[PDB]
Amino acid sequence: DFSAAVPFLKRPSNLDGAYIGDVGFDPLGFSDVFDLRVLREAELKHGRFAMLAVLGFIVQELYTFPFFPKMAPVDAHDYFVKQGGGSQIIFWISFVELFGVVALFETLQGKREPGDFAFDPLGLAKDEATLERYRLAEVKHARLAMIAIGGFIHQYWVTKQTVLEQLGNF
Amino acid sequence: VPGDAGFDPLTISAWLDSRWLREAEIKHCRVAMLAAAGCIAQDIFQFPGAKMTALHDAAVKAGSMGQMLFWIGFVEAISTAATIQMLQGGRARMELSEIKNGRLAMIGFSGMVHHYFITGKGPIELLTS
Amino acid sequence: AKSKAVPFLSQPEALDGSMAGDVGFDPFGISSVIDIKWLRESELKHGRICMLAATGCLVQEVVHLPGPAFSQKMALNAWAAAPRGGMISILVAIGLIEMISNRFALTATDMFANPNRVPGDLGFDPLSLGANPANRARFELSEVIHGRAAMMGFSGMVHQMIVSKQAPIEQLMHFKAVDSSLMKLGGAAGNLGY
Amino acid sequence: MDSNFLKYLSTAPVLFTVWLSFTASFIIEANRFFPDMLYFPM
Amino acid sequence: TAVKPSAQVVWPIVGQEVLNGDVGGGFQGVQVTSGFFQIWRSSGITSEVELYWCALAGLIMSGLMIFAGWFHYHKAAPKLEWFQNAESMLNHHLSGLLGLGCLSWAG
Amino acid sequence: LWNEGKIQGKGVSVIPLFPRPASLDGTFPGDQGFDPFGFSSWVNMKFVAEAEIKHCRLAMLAFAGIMVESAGISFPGATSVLGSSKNIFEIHDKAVASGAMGQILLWVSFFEVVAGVPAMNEMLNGESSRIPGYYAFDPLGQGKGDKMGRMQLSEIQNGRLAMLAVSGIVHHTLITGKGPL
Ligand code: CLA
Ligand code: CLA
Ligand code: CLA
Ligand SMILES: CCCCCCCCCCCCCCCCCC(=O)OC[C@H](CO[C@@H]1O[C@H](CO)[C@H](O)[C@H](O)[C@H]1O)OC(=O)CCCCCCCCCCCCCCCCC
Ligand SMILES: CCCCCCCCCCCCCCCC(=O)OC[C@H](COP(=O)(O)OC[C@@H](O)CO)OC(=O)CCCCCCCCCCCCCCC
Ligand SMILES: CC1=C(C#C/C(C)=C/C=C/C(C)=C/C=C/C=C(C)/C=C/C=C(\C)C#CC2=C(C)C[C@@H](O)CC2(C)C)C(C)(C)C[C@H](O)C1
Ligand SMILES: CC1=C(C#C/C(C)=C/C=C/C(C)=C/C=C/C=C(C)/C=C/C=C(\C)C#CC2=C(C)C[C@@H](O)CC2(C)C)C(C)(C)C[C@H](O)C1
Ligand SMILES: CC1=C(C#C/C(C)=C/C=C/C(C)=C/C=C/C=C(C)/C=C/C=C(\C)C#CC2=C(C)C[C@@H](O)CC2(C)C)C(C)(C)C[C@H](O)C1
């Protein structure tokens, strides 16, 4: 009848809690129009990019490879635009995203979970129960990292200080 | 149903939804209550490091008003979902009390802002002078 | 019923683990569109040419036929320096080999018209090295894998010869990195031409 | 991929426009890298 | 008064780059006659950044109209009694479309 | 010995922090139920077991070699051709230049091509049922019953210890910049 997250809003019809991390939060009604599978594909893909990027920031201030010049991550974006390594990374992301297009076609055809690439080399998921717990954690971390990366880049744009140095100063 | 003194002389309720009208009245009430409590508060005390209408103009340059607008706008977008859904589809005493106090605050703030246009003074300053 | 190569995709039909190197890798579903017999004939043919091509680049680095026209250590220069009459002789001989070895069943409408015809089996066993049936599975597997590897390796060597105008072994032994001043990728439409 | 969308891309105008755009595209690319070919060079 | 408006540049392919004539302002391109430059100066654009923002605004509107056509045919299609409101449509197209269009443009 | 259930056995975890995996059975020698990443489920156990023992033997030989060279113990005339320094890194570079490392490489690689690869492939395929790491090398015996239990466990544990030690020793030498002992 109503949403778990927003008490005064009604729970969206397409949000039945089947996807982990669901709390009924969809006021603008994007699930009433679009396929939720595609939207969870997009949520997990944006979030995984954001999580890799927030670790990307933190490690890039802490360390940089000796063959690459020491510099700030947004300056790293521009340097690797002009150097060629950005095009390398874009090509290899695009190459993986080809099979991601195939994977999304498998999701639309009903035969794949929206974020599952069966990528468990280290076997951390043991049974279904821990997989569900990890999955809820993954979506929560994905959403939190999407907000966090926007903060890290916007704070750098306003104050030309890196995230670790901005915590260190002020 | 709360705060019903039988006072609808122009009969607005006949030609607009009582739910949309009540949402507008209650939202105006609350906003006005915060505004009236705010007017007196600015004169009584100032948050560290920090005019009825001119201070708004100063704040937009400082971005203080702009940050408040963005966050209130996000809550309001969720509130727009709530208003559309409501239109589509102790505590009793407190609802009447909230409506009456909010109506008094609507008039209260209205008085404070016209007092500011007249003497250029805050509501506490109006009592002081 | 998932692929073993790509675990999150469904196992492709016409891939049933019978063929050597059938690890379940067809994400784009070309085997569902193109008959697997033609694709395995083409895969074996590409790989066999590439196995010779990889060996060609490395061996032409080490050993040359005599004479000044065959003295090009860098392999992409041998294309231009080698006598044209003989390179067109190679090309014509390849065309003759294609017509006789495929037995005039060359097209995608008449190769495998004989039900006895097998993908990749052109009848090539001069020394009867496939006379032992036991090695057939391993050999066919190792031919396919050697072919795939040589496709990847030759592709690398060519594009490393383009980037660094150096032959592959002496590019490994006199390695100079990519400066990025030149060899920029793309850019024909960014500057609007020129 | 959907079989009805692939059957739509197999329709005559789509294949005609894609094939003649591909045809036009390699005529354009061949005249970009190797322009002014009035003759077969021999 | 000296620079000639040009918003189209050709690629050099078959000698067709002769069409990038000297329109002025250190520029080569096809001279355009649609009067957009005079519209943009009348709007007060005075920057190419603001022209990029107008291009994005047009792109967002193009996406919203193609979405609205899909939505209003496939998700929520009005009934015939909705379309047969000529009084309501005229009230809105005079007041809302043309009237707030002029009012907002005058503003 | 084997001592199943106490060491080298089912229900045996060296670290209880990491749970005993079902995929790791007690059959392989020196199995202490240590598999946090669960490789045992998808890997070929015969291959990884043979690979483990070969790494162990290489490491134990590595530890003895590093200890002898670090101590300055040398074969007659060897110091003259090779590096005088007892640094393992310096000796290896000098040995490469002399050709000693090349000769060792040639013969080790030749053994692996002609014997190591056939033994590995036949063990995995099922042609000889070779026990992982078995190279039929018992010149002074010490095999039979002892080999099945204590000797196999002693080799696996000492070799794991050696692998860790050799790793430590080279990184100690790198960060310190000076050789051990
Ligand atoms: C005041 C309300 C209003 C407005 C602005 C419009 C506007 C429009 N209607 Mg109409 N319409 C209305 C009420 C309104 N309608 C009502 C009440 C009915 C029911 C009787 C209809 C029934 C109706 C039909 C049946 C048709 C239209 C069509 C059209 C479009 C005409 C083509 C054109 O010039 O677009 C270009 C001009 C523009 C301004 C494009 C902007 C597009 C948006 C929708 C305008 C409003 C945006 C928003 C309100 C502005 C917010 C401002 C903010 C930034 C501060 C135009 C978008 C025709 C059409 O083309 O269908 C799509 C058509 O067939 N309408
Ligand atoms: C109809 C038969 C015929 C005739 C008369 C010629 C005549 C000629 N050829 Mg051509 N050729 C032929 C068939 C023929 N060719 C075929 C079928 C091939 C393809 C395999 C070639 C490939 C070829 C190349 C690549 C070259 C020639 C060259 C020459 C010329 C110099 C010959 C010379 O000095 O020989 C005396 C020299 C020799 C006898 C040396 C032979 C070298 C060894 C045996 C090569 C190793 C063979 C190698 C393993 C190939 C195996 C694949 C094969 C079994 C399919 C001469 C005009 C050369 C040229 O134009 O130079 C100016 C040259 O570069 N030929
Ligand atoms: C095939 C259709 C077509 C095309 C491609 C063009 C192309 C062009 N027109 Mg034209 N136009 C057309 C049909 C077309 N027109 C029709 C049918 C009319 C009659 C309504 C006009 C009236 C018209 C005017 C009045 C103006 C143009 C202008 C332009 C140019 C700039 C495009 C632009 O942003 O306009 C932007 C348009 C403006 C900036 C001014 C718009 C003012 C009108 C009055 C707005 C009316 C909107 C309203 C919804 C109309 C409803 C119809 C009414 C009877 C109810 C460009 C050369 C402009 C131009 O030539 O500048 C050099 C210009 O001022 N057009
Ligand atoms: C019936 C056929 C019988 C054939 C018998 C012969 C063939 C038998 C099989 C042989 C298989 C190949 C074996 C090698 C043959 C040549 C031996 C040789 O001398 O090579 C020749 C070269 C060295 O060449 C040396 O050059 C010196 C001068 O510079 C010397 O003076 C000598 O000329 C020569 O010894 O060997 C190498 O380059 C080896 C490179 C390293 C190879 C691996 C080493 C061992 C593995 C550990 C590496 C770990 C690396 C981790 C990552 C590090 C990243 C930096
Ligand atoms: C199975 C075989 C797998 C092959 C893998 C391919 C490896 C190489 C692929 C590119 C590597 C990295 C590219 C960075 C290089 C790059 O992105 O350059 C950018 C270039 C456009 O130029 P820009 O607008 O970027 O100019 C940018 C400015 O910075 C400089 O002026 O993009 C292209 O269009 C070039 C490619 C040709 C596009 C058409 C190719 C031919 C079409 C044939 C049919 C389709 C085939 C597939 C098409 C995608
Ligand atoms: C360039 C570079 C690198 C990099 C990088 C990369 C790849 C970075 C990737 C970053 C990404 C993909 C960030 C994704 C952000 C998405 C956001 C914030 C979504 C917000 C949506 C919200 C809040 C909502 C909502 C909604 C919900 C759900 C319900 C609706 O009904 C309503 C509503 C609209 C409210 C790094 C940084 C490592 C450094 C390097 O040296 C250089
Ligand atoms: C068909 C196809 C495939 C394929 C393939 C491919 C690409 C095959 C390529 C085959 C090649 C490269 C054959 C090369 C032959 C070279 C010859 C005969 C050299 C002769 C030298 C001469 C006569 C001389 C001389 C002398 C001269 C004149 C003057 C001196 O100063 C110099 C010198 C002393 C040297 C395969 C097999 C993979 C699979 C499938 O079945 C489909
Ligand atoms: C079948 C048959 C028989 C036969 C026969 C024949 C002709 C057998 C020949 C078989 C051949 C030629 C096999 C060659 C494979 C080459 C490979 C896999 C190379 C891969 C290179 C890679 C991965 C790389 C790379 C590299 C990169 C890019 C970076 C570079 O800087 C360097 C580097 C090189 C390291 C006979 C005739 C005996 C009779 C019998 O009755 C039937």
From Swiss-Prot, chain D:
The chain crosses the membrane at residues 8-28. Keywords: Chloroplast, Membrane, Photosynthesis, Photosystem I, Plastid, Thylakoid, Transmembrane, Transmembrane helix. It is a single-pass membrane protein. Disulfide bonds: none annotated. GO terms for cellular component: chloroplast thylakoid membrane; photosystem I. The keyword Ion transport does not apply. It comes from the Eukaryota. It holds the Pfam family PSI_PsaJ. SUPFAM superfamilies: Subunit IX of photosystem I reaction centre, PsaJ. May help in the organization of the PsaE and PsaF subunits. This is Photosystem I reaction center subunit IX. It comes from Rhodomonas salina.
